[PDB]
Amino acid sequence: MNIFEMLRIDEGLRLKIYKDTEGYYTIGIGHLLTKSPSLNAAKSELDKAIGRNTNGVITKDEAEKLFNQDVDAAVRGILRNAKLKPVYDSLDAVRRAALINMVFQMGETGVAGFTNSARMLQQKRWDEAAVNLAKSRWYNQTPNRAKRVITTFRTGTWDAYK
Ligand SMILES: [Cl-]
Ligand SMILES: [Cl-]
């Protein structure tokens, strides 16, 4: 198991514009297009992302292309972030995947704010971090995905994904 598969499991694949758990316009593998309520605006962002007039629909390859960009962007974001980078460098390969997942989902900033859990992760207090991570809107809104992510940080294995 790796980051791509992991995220593919958490986000799914949709080739047609859809609304996310928050009600935001999305396409492919969790690619947020816009926070605006307008489908038009969404479609326009989509066309700009793909580089063609899509009319709200894309192919698998297109979706995968957005996905590769998005993962690349997430790692790079962590790496440039002053609060995140150290957390990331302190972790093993599996747990690094867990942190990338949260960032892909909630953005850097979002993640940069679990200040207390970050400290705990850096000190390698797994059980503690997992508890603290659970006290969050994140966990309350997407409890099943969140539990998968937290078990990965707790255990250091891919078990939640098997
Ligand atoms: Cl884009
Ligand atoms: Cl969920």
Side-chain angles (χ1 to χ4, degrees):
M1 162 91 50
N2 57 61
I3 190 55
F4 290 89
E5 294 190 36
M6 190 197 201
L7 275 164
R8 166 97 182 57
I9 282 160
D10 283 334
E11 298 290 348
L13 170 71
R14 312 221 15 211
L15 291 193
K16 178 58 239 238
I17 296 177
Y18 69 88
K19 298 207 203 164
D20 73 10
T21 71
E22 295 292 348
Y24 308 135
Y25 288 125
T26 309
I27 198 147
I29 296 138
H31 185 81
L32 173 70
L33 292 162
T34 195
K35 259 145 214 229
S36 133
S38 170
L39 180 78
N40 292 307
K43 282 164 158 228
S44 163
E45 281 304 295
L46 179 59
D47 278 6
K48 159 157 69 84
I50 295 312
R52 70 186 174 73
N53 213 122
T54 62
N55 197 40
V57 179
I58 58 167
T59 73
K60 190 177 177 92
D61 283 0
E62 272 167 355
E64 268 160 5
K65 183 152 222 224
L66 288 187
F67 187 35
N68 282 334
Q69 294 165 178
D70 298 334
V71 176
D72 186 49
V75 178
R76 271 169 317 112
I78 283 166
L79 308 168
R80 274 199 264 98
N81 185 294
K83 286 88 141 10
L84 299 177
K85 189 172 182 294
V87 189
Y88 190 89
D89 284 344
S90 72
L91 295 170
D92 59 89
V94 181
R95 300 179 164 95
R96 276 181 185 170
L99 184 73
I100 292 174
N101 191 308
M102 297 186 65
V103 172
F104 180 97
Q105 189 191 356
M106 79 193 92
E108 235 190 77
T109 322
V111 190
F114 283 58
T115 249
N116 307 316
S117 305
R119 180 187 73 244
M120 288 167 228
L121 293 164
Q122 262 173 281
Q123 302 175 95
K124 313 198 176 270
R125 302 164 150 62
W126 326 117
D127 282 25
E128 297 157 50
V131 161
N132 189 263
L133 280 164
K135 298 199 204 156
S136 56
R137 178 173 193 276
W138 170 57
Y139 181 84
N140 284 103
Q141 301 302 127
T142 44
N144 290 323
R145 169 174 192 162
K147 298 185 163 115
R148 287 194 294 272
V149 176
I150 295 166
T151 290
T152 300
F153 274 128
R154 203 181 16 103
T155 71
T157 68
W158 292 114
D159 297 339
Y161 290 79
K162 337 195 251 230

